């Protein structure tokens, strides 16, 4: 089909890795925010967020109804990882 590429965002649902559920938006909200939302520090202790049991970038916004899972830390992987942004 047509590779889904930014096609009018929409209200999606993201289930926490604890079971809890949250509201998000496709190409609007990310796994970094969802966590950030929680008591400051949670997202602080994160690495790579899994979206639908698939590696997802914290800077990358979800795509649709999927599950969020914060990793404790990388484990046999390189290249695919955040990039030191400006200022810090």
Q: How far apart are CA 51 and CA 63, in angstroms?
A: 9
Most distant pair of Cα atoms in the chain: their distance = 41
Main-chain phi, psi angles of 44, to 5 degrees: -60, -35
Distance from C-alpha of 59 to C-alpha of 61, rounded to nearest angstrom: 6
Instruction: Choose the CATH number for 10-71 among 1.10.230.10, 3.10.20.30, 3.30.2130.10, 1.20.1370.10.
Output: 3.10.20.30
SS3 track for the chain: CCCCCCCCCCEEEEECCCCCEEEEECCCCCHHHHHHHCCCCCHHHCCCEEECCCEECCCCCCCCCEEEEECCCCCCCCCCCCCCCCCC
Q: Is 87 left (phi over 0), alpha (psi -120 to 50) or beta?
A: left
User: Of 5, 42, 49, 47, nearest to 27 (Cα)?
Assistant: 5
Cβ-contact 68, 33 below 8 angstroms: no
Q: Determine the length of the chain.
A: 88
């Amino acid at each position: 089909g047509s590779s889904g590429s930014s096609g009018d965002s929409k209200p999606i649902k993201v289930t926490l890795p604890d079971g809890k559920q949250v509201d998000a938006e496709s190409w609007k909200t990310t796994p970094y925010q969802i966590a950030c939302g929680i008591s400051q520090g949670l997202a602080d202790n994160t690495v790579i967020a899994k979206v639908n049991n698939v590696v997802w970038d914290l800077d990358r916004p979800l795509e649709e109804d999927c599950t969020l899972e914060l990793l404790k830390f990388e484990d046999e992987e390189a290249q695919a990882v955040y990039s030191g942004p400006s200022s810090g």
